[PDB]
Write a protein that binds this ligand. Structure first.
Ligand SMILES: [Fe+2]
Ligand SMILES: [Fe+2]
Ligand SMILES: [Fe+2]
Ligand SMILES: [Fe+2]
Ligand SMILES: [Fe+2]
Ligand SMILES: [Fe+2]
Ligand SMILES: [Fe+2]
Lengths: 216, 216, 216
């Protein structure tokens, strides 16, 4: 025969011709169909529904099934740059600080006192002839007759004591200035999830036929 | 027939033997070709170019077309870790600060004045007999005849007044010290783009034949 | 002939019928197989092992081979949000600062001295008639005869100088206060790697048959 019994035939109609059967995985009687049994010694006609025919390679058995499966491949990919913006730090408060204690000191001073001390002294007078010497006599006093000086006397000093007026009230400036800090951010990553793409089946362009087989 | 009319025949040449026709989508005459009309009641031969044959599953009509399509799948993916390094804060300027006002005080002093005040007194002298008593007589003064003292006098004080020398210029130190801050960085993501991989069509290893069909 | 010589036949058995040959890429005797020579003018039967038949599309020669290949597709993807947390800045040390120099001043003061300076004076006495006037005579002094005063004298002042007691030790407070900074984080991204998914080959659901061909 030009097309041997048992070879699958692609049939374009749901009306199956007399003498043929749909290939649907069914058993048959090997005694009743001796030529079909040459093609299928198991006595089972393969289920061809949803199947494509592939020429048997080395490493695969005849009538073995193979699932659909996508070929190994990957993808290039990239992530958008993200700007994290500006952040504000916690507040630090230096409060109020004290200075060291300093400023103990003395002053010096000099001057003149006021002018004072004007005075006179009393002198005992004596009279009566017979005795002379030493004492002031007032024997003859009718008219002025000039005058004269005591000897010198009266060198002296005084002590002084004082508290001063209150002074010295003051303040200072202190230049503090400006500063910055650094902040180490360190390292980080993210978890990447790639979503599914595709159909329930892997397919190529195909037209549907009913696989049939000649019984005898 | 061992291969019924209407079943597709894969043919290895571009020369189509007489009695057969290339399956190209063409309409045919159903009265001229009634056995072909049994297989193709619509009067149209399917266009098999670029097509593979698939056995018809439940849920698909005989001769329905199915496009090529990749099977549902995803990929695992990862993001490299990134070191953000070190960031500098803004500058804060404390400028110059002023202290409180303090340091009002007094001093005391004491001592002695210089020794001064030596002096003598003039005494009015009188002369001439007939009057006596009280006053100083200069009646007889030819030669020295001792001497004597006045009574005591002369107790007194003085006032004083002064400004002092300038003193008290000084400075202080002030311990400021060190500080840190904390800063909250927060959260972020990235937009992930995955590029296309693959061909115009989804294909399997295939050899090209011309599908032809027997007419009668 | 209902299936012409040279058309490939899917055979379900490893035992090939007599008068057919596995399509394995072999050459053939063109004179001995003249109808086969019309189907295959090259004298070569194509290798059908691992092959699917596809209908010859335009732009492609009959019996040419086509490799398996995934259809162009991509995937959506996403990256998880990452909290970078709280970071501590570097420590900044203002250390110890100095103030400006100020505080130079004077004080005033006033008061009275102690009361001192009581004294008397010696007076020289003279005697002997023949000279008169001016000087103190002691001619006649037997009994007391009242007394009189010297003239006024003795106005004077003194100088003083001193160092004062120690005073003026003190300190100040200075309000510094609180501050924060801002910190610009800048931008970053990540290298994204997508891993391979799939099998050695692109496949659809298939059953393996031995492609054979009728010789004569
Ligand atoms: Fe002072
Ligand atoms: Fe700071
Ligand atoms: Fe993919
Ligand atoms: Fe005096
Ligand atoms: Fe005095
Ligand atoms: Fe001070
Ligand atoms: Fe990131």
């Amino acid at each position: 025969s030009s097309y041997p019994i048992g070879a699958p035939i692609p049939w374009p109609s749901d009306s199956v011709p007399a003498g043929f059967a749909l290939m649907e995985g069914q058993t048959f009687d090997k005694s009743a169909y001796p030529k079909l049994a040459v093609a299928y010694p198991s006595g089972v006609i393969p289920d061809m529904r949803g199947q494509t025919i592939k020429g048997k390679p080395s490493g695969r058995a005849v009538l073995s099934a193979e699932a659909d499966g996508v070929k190994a491949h990957s993808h290039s990919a990239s992530a958008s740059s993200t700007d994290l913006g500006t952040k504000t730090t916690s507040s630090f408060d230096y409060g109020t600080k004290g200075t060291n204690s300093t400023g103990g000191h003395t002053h010096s001073g000099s001057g003149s006192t006021s002018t004072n001390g004007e005075h006179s002294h009393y002198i005992e007078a004596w009279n009566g002839t017979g005795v002379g010497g030493n004492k002031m006599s007032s024997y003859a006093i009718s008219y002025r007759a000039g005058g004269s000086n005591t000897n010198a006397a009266g060198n002296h000093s005084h002590t002084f004591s004082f508290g001063t007026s209150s002074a010295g009230d003051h303040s200072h400036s202190v230049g503090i200035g400006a500063h910055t800090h650094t902040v180490a951010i360190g390292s980080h990553g993210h978890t990447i999830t790639v979503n599914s793409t595709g159909n329930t089946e892997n397919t190529v362009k195909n037209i549907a036929f009913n696989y049939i087989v000649r019984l005898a």
